């Protein structure tokens, strides 16, 4: 259960919170898991997906073991566009098909300074909890 008497557990409230979410908050919502490989290395479950990570689509039609680079992040549409994840429209023009970030797995991160410091913060909290549990 949730016991904190200031959170909500109220369909209408959670959905309204979700759909009318502000960009910086959507960043967090649009997170996606690391590959087991990276999960081992960084000590982090998942990361906020970003403009030019390398990525697999895990479920759907485009479900496949190819590793496409991310193309853009349409936070309004809760979606990311990926390199070869696309479909030919009526008149031949390719159109980047949206995939939801959570149905995707990050194989290669785009590491900047800030992304580096984020991963350092998440790994540290994870190991504090393991120390507290032990």
């Amino acid at each position: 259960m949730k016991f904190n008497p200031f959170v909500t557990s109220d369909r209408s409230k959670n959905r309204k919170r979700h759909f009318n979410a502000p960009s910086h908050i959507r960043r967090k919502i649009m997170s996606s898991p690391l590959s087991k490989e990276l999960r081992q290395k960084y000590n982090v479950r998942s990361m906020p997906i970003r403009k030019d990570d390398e990525v697999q689509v895990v479920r759907g039609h485009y479900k496949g073991q190819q590793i496409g680079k991310v193309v853009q992040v349409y936070r309004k549409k809760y979606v990311i566009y990926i390199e070869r994840v696309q479909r030919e429209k009526a008149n031949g023009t390719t159109v980047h098909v949206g995939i939801h970030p959570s149905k995707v797995v990050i194989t290669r991160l785009k590491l900047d300074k800030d992304r580096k410091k984020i991963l350092e913060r998440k790994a540290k909290s994870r190991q504090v909890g393991k120390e507290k549990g032990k």
Binding site: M1, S9, D10, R11
Partner: protein
């Protein structure tokens, strides 16, 4: 329903003589809502017949002995495998029905322990059946935060939380009670009498101190004892084919004289 609901219009009846129908009709304007039908419980817009009030007598208060009588009745039938099995609880492989346990079970701080306990005691197959029942609710309570529904599980009466109520918490189905604060809403859910519980020896000792035996007061509920029984020999089959009674009955006329 709101006070102003339905009456926020100003609407007069065009009286008789206009054909139409003597309802109050919205006054003036160049809209669809003009010369309509206000206030009447029948009209669109309108005003529900006998709008519901807040001061409906919601709460309902019950005599204290009666409340206790119910709670004794539920306890008494938490024994009786038949009444527990009939109430659905898969209590087939459980070792003894007023199921009482060691008081390390106060100790446990992890679900891990609490589940392992339930599997040794063979009470897990109730929890298993709780998982099996988890399904979506029928209809409008879905859109009002009652979306999922399931079974009631094993009760677990404890005497003191030394950690226990944390341990049994995520195990779906389980409700934990204090002995000193029992509740008929939980001991007889659905107003239905049986329910598999799991006692802690510390708690299971305390019951007689709480409720008082037949020749001893409550000694904890000031002025109380058990309710006395109306009839003692419940098995009437043992009565009716006794020597004493069948001695004194005419022989049963049983021929069938048809027309």
């Amino acid at each position: 329903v709101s006070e102003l609901a339905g009456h926020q219009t100003s609407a007069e009846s065009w009286g008789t003589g206009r054909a139409v129908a003597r309802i109050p009709r919205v006054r003036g304007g160049g809209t669809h809502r003009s010369g309509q039908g206000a206030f009447g419980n029948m009209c669109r817009g309108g005003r529900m017949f006998a709008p519901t009030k807040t001061w409906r007598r919601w709460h309902r208060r019950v005599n204290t002995t009666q409340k206790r009588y119910a709670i004794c009745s539920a306890l008494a039938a938490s024994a009786l495998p038949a009444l527990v099995m009939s109430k659905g609880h898969r209590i087939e492989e459980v070792p003894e029905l007023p199921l009482v346990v060691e008081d390390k079970v106060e100790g446990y701080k992890k679900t891990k322990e609490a589940v392992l306990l339930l599997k040794k005691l063979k009470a897990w197959n109730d929890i298993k059946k709780v998982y099996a029942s988890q399904r979506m609710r029928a209809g409008k309570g879905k859109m009002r935060n009652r979306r999922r529904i399931q079974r009631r599980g094993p009760c677990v009466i404890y005497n003191e939380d030394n950690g226990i109520v944390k341990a049994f918490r995520n195990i779906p189905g389980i409700t934990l009670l204090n002995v000193t604060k029992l509740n008929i809403l939980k001991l007889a859910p659905g107003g239905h009498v049986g329910r598999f519980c799991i006692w802690t020896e510390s708690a299971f000792r305390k019951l007689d101190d709480l409720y008082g035996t037949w020749r001893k007061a409550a000694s904890l509920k000031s002025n109380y004892n058990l309710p006395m029984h109306k009839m003692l020999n419940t098995d009437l089959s043992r009565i009716l084919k006794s020597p004493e009674i069948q001695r004194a009955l005419r022989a049963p006329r049983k021929k069938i004289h048809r027309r």
